[PDB]
Amino acid sequence: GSHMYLRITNIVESSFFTKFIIYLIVLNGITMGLETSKTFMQSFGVYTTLFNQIVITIFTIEIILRIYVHRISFFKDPWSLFDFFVVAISLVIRRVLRVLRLFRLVTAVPQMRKIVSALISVIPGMLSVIALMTLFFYIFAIMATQLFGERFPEWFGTLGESFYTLFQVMTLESWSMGIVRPLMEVYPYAWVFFIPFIFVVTFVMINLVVAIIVDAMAIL
Amino acid sequence: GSHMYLRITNIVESSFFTKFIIYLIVLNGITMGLETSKTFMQSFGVYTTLFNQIVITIFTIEIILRIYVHRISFFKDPWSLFDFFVVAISLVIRRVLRVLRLFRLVTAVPQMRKIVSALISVIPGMLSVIALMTLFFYIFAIMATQLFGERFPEWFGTLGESFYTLFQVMTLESWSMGIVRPLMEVYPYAWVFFIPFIFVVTFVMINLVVAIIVDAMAIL
Amino acid sequence: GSHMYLRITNIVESSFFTKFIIYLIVLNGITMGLETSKTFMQSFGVYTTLFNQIVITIFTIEIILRIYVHRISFFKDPWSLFDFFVVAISLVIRRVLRVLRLFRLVTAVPQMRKIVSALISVIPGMLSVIALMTLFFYIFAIMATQLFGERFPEWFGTLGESFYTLFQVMTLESWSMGIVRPLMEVYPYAWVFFIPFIFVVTFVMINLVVAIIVDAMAIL
Amino acid sequence: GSHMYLRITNIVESSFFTKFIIYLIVLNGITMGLETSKTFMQSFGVYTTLFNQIVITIFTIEIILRIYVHRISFFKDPWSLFDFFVVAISLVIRRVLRVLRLFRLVTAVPQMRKIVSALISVIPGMLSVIALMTLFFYIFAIMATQLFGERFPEWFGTLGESFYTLFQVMTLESWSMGIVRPLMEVYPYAWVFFIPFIFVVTFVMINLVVAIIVDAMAIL
Ligand SMILES: CCCCCCCCCCCCCC(=O)OC[C@H](COP(=O)(O)OCC[N+](C)(C)C)OC(=O)CCCCCCCCCCCCC
Ligand SMILES: CCCCCCCCCCCCCC(=O)OC[C@H](COP(=O)(O)OCC[N+](C)(C)C)OC(=O)CCCCCCCCCCCCC
Ligand SMILES: CCCCCCCCCCCCCC(=O)OC[C@H](COP(=O)(O)OCC[N+](C)(C)C)OC(=O)CCCCCCCCCCCCC
Ligand SMILES: CCCCCCCCCCCCCC(=O)OC[C@H](COP(=O)(O)OCC[N+](C)(C)C)OC(=O)CCCCCCCCCCCCC
């Protein structure tokens, strides 16, 4: 609590400081969208690559100062931890990790924190169902890998291939025309595997949303 | 408030006046559906093109009188502003803009105003989530444009192409058979991009509707 | 109220009488499923065609007696009117109309009447939205028929073709891969027509179900 | 209630006993996922096949002891009956039935029993609607088998083929591009069969979920 610590603390905790970050984030948002254009990279190529280094410097500077002012409390703050790693991740597909910077606009702007927290608060109630769901996939991914993986390697050769395909069946994306009707050319009873799979997986997802609705009706 | 202003005001505010517009709208609705038929345009070609000019005249006449009688209040009335521009838009793909006329049937008929207002009143609560949603698309549209846009220009070459495709993935339309399974031929880990994208985008849309339901349960 | 009228009335209003109809219906249900088999039609061909005449006789007999016993009240009873026409429709694709007989199993069995009435009672509240919905399709079916019907006759040549396709887009069935991406080969801005169409049509359907839920929460 | 019965009863009813089963189940879960790998079966082939015999022995031992300790009450316990048959089914596509073992992890772990019971408790209320639903499919499966089964055997030749296709149409999977648009090449009015089919089947599923939500709002 010296005159040195309170100097930085009054800057960091200032409203300008935050507005500066938000203003940066948004610019770097824009400029990363322009870096898409080969037209514009061909011209203003150097102007952007430094600007991304400048902003990560500023963000590192910023993320250091936030640590000083908060020390251990900073590492008990999701949004800081997020801002931490996202800036770290962007320091170290190399160029890709960068754009995660822009996710800070959620951390920085507090109407987003609000919304994001609303959505995340729903996830804890679901884990019980997600657990049953993921066990169910695991059991069925195994069955399908050995039932069909032989004559149908592309879709069910590995365990992970049956995982992907089964998740595809869950989304109902081409499940019949693209998968189960071809499987039936060889294994005419595969419909006994997949229609029950659809029913179960569907019913669960339905109930899940009913639960989400009713869990957020116990509060009203 | 002269004897001239009250003359028109008693006509405009009359019930016949409105019934006349509604009756027109519906006819012009019908006749624009017949203008679809090359058979019927080949015969009654002239009969319709003037009829659309007649009706826009009447609608301009009408939309003028509504302004006199209401002056500035007319430009603080959505439904008037809508009726205004829709008739203006139809005055100035040229022939297309016309058919927007028919949208007045919503403005004119008050059981539609009712329904339309019910739906629009939900939109303000959503913007917070839509904002987070559109930021999320923007970030991912950028990643996919550089991750895949090279070997896959048709789907991810521009930023807007990744936008369209990502919205397609959101609708789950052919997302696996049509997009992610082909991408995996080249980039075998693309599933790490798209399954999380689906989960997030899905979960949000789910919560959005839960919110819509619960926001309209705080009123009951 | 003679000794003749009360004779039939005590038979018609009996529990056996109803059990007999239900028992018939179910048999004719079964036998119509067997008439699917060319194998079984090749053998027991005559046995079934008379059995369907027998049952419609019995149903006509039955539907006459119900009229005697109830006279005008019979034509103020949906379920009778339904039973009426379904038996009439089956008297007069000829063979198809028959199978509608089986829909009486809903009329006859009262746990179905219950469920069916629960579902129908929801329809009156929706008409307002359905009206706005069908107007919206009509307006857009017109626009698409003239925007695209030329270079794309199969999907948008008539008005009804644009209706079908637009309903297909609503179901999100192949809307992008199958329709809007091909349209974009020629008309690169068609996405400005169809994404807004999807948004509107989607949002409405969402709200519709929210309304259905909340309209059946004003009762609790 | 001898000193012999209480010996086993105190073992079976112990917490270790259950932890041992759960620990086994999870291992056998893991090892059955590795038996997917031809790589790993080529090496550790014998190690796994006995391990599955060992575990079913233990599970048979276990499932015997549970019967002693509970006698007739064991056959009035779903979870036991389930554990019973799943172990029996795994004793007697031969190798497939095995993996059903892993479903015991639901029976064993009581946070799963909880979730599973929550979902099953919803099914009794639905049967009334499911009954109407399955009758409806039956009636329409019959109509489509005779309307289209001739020129379109692959999709509607048998009754079961029309069942599968109609369930596919219900899922909206390729219903137009893949089925109804081809049917329309020959039978141009098939849209009169399938759009109403979609509407009905959709509306019902919607209401079903509304019911599920409201039936679980009578408890709050
Ligand atoms: C955290 C950050 C928040 C700030 C968000 C900032 C939003 C604005 C970003 C703007 C980025 C614009 C990028 C852009 O235009 O890229 C170029 C591409 C394709 O152009 P290009 O490749 O040059 O084509 C050249 C063709 N030639 C040679 C014949 C002339 O152009 C296109 O393909 C069009 C791209 C349209 C992009 C629409 C962006 C919507 C952003 C919504 C953000 C919401 C945030 C809450
Ligand atoms: C704001 C306005 C409200 C008023 C709404 C008025 C509704 C009624 C509009 C009727 C428009 C009829 C248009 C029409 O039939 O167009 C022609 C087409 C195709 O015929 P065409 O091209 O002549 O084929 C000739 C073939 N040939 C040479 C071999 C004979 O025929 C078809 O393809 C059949 C088109 C069926 C259209 C169904 C319209 C439903 C309208 C629902 C409106 C609800 C409003 C709340
Ligand atoms: C209002 C009425 C209520 C009463 C409902 C009665 C339900 C039972 C109806 C049974 C109908 C059975 C029809 C049937 O099996 O048709 C034959 C077909 C195909 O056989 P087929 O064409 O003879 O194949 C010959 C092949 N060959 C020469 C090599 C031997 O066989 C198949 O393709 C199998 C068909 C399976 C049908 C499943 C029916 C489920 C009915 C659920 C009803 C619920 C009502 C609430
Ligand atoms: C009731 C039981 C509860 C216990 C659950 C235990 C969960 C862990 C199970 C692990 C199983 C691993 C199986 C595995 O890796 O299989 C091998 C495959 C493909 O490898 P492989 O076929 O050897 O490829 C050789 C290629 N070569 C020759 C060029 C080297 O590898 C793959 O394709 C990757 C497979 C990823 C599987 C992801 C599993 C997620 C399980 C989630 C369980 C949740 C339970 C609540």
From TrEMBL, chains A, B, C, D:
Binding of sn-glycerol 3-phosphate 1, residues: 33, 37
Transmembrane segments: 15-34, 46-69, 81-94, 115-143, 189-214
Positions of Ca(2+) 2 binding: 174
Bilayer topology: Multi-pass membrane protein
Protein localization: Membrane
Binding positions for sn-glycerol 3-phosphate 3 per the UniProt entry: 158-160
Main location: membrane
GO CC terms of this entry: voltage-gated sodium channel complex
Identification of the protein by name: Ion transport protein
Whole-protein coverage range: 1 to 224 of 267
